[PDB]
């Protein structure tokens, strides 16, 4: 099974979306996982399926909101290792 995607970058495009790009693990499908950020409670994260591309615009997000972005390759047992999280805030505030 593959390791984590390499050289991940993420930057907001507008108040509702983020352009995520990466290089393959050291694979035709990936997941992008986006989690909105005193007891460690979290709302439901977003997941995006990506096929046959090494970048993707994740959309439908909340304005003025911090998101943790991770990418994973898809494998026979589920996701491979996730890239180290990138925290980015959408504009709109
Ligand atoms: Zn996944
Ligand atoms: Zn999937």
Please, what are the domains in the chain? 6-89 (2.60.40.10)
Distance of alpha carbon 78 from alpha carbon 41, whole angstroms: 24
Ligand 2 center from residue 80 Cα (angstroms): 12
Ligand 2 center from residue 64 Cα (angstroms): 27
- Technique used by the depositors: X-ray
Ligand 1 center from residue 69 Cα (angstroms): 12
In terms of C-beta density within 10 A (0-12 exposed, 13-18 middle, 19 or more buried), how is residue 77 classed?
exposed
What three-state secondary structure class fits 4?
coil
Around ion ligand 2, residues with a beta carbon closer than 5 Å are 49
Contacts of residue 32, Cβ cutoff 8 Å, sequence gap at least 6:
20, 47, 48, 50, 56, 58, 69, 70, 71
The structure tokens 């593959």 sit at 2
Q: Which two tokens stand for residue 61?
A: 């997000």
Q: Which two tokens stand for residue 92?
A: 């709109």
């Amino acid at each position: 099974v593959p390791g984590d995607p390499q050289d991940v970058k993420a930057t907001p495009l507008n108040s509702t979306s983020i352009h995520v790009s990466w290089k393959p693990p050291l694979i035709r499908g990936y997941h992008i996982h986006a989690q909105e950020l005193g007891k460690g409670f979290l709302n439901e994260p977003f997941k995006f399926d990506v096929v046959d591309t090494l970048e993707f615009n994740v959309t439908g997000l909340q304005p003025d909101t911090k998101y943790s972005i991770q990418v994973a390759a898809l494998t026979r047992k589920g996701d491979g290792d996730r890239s180290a999280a990138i925290v980015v805030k959408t504009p709109g505030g």
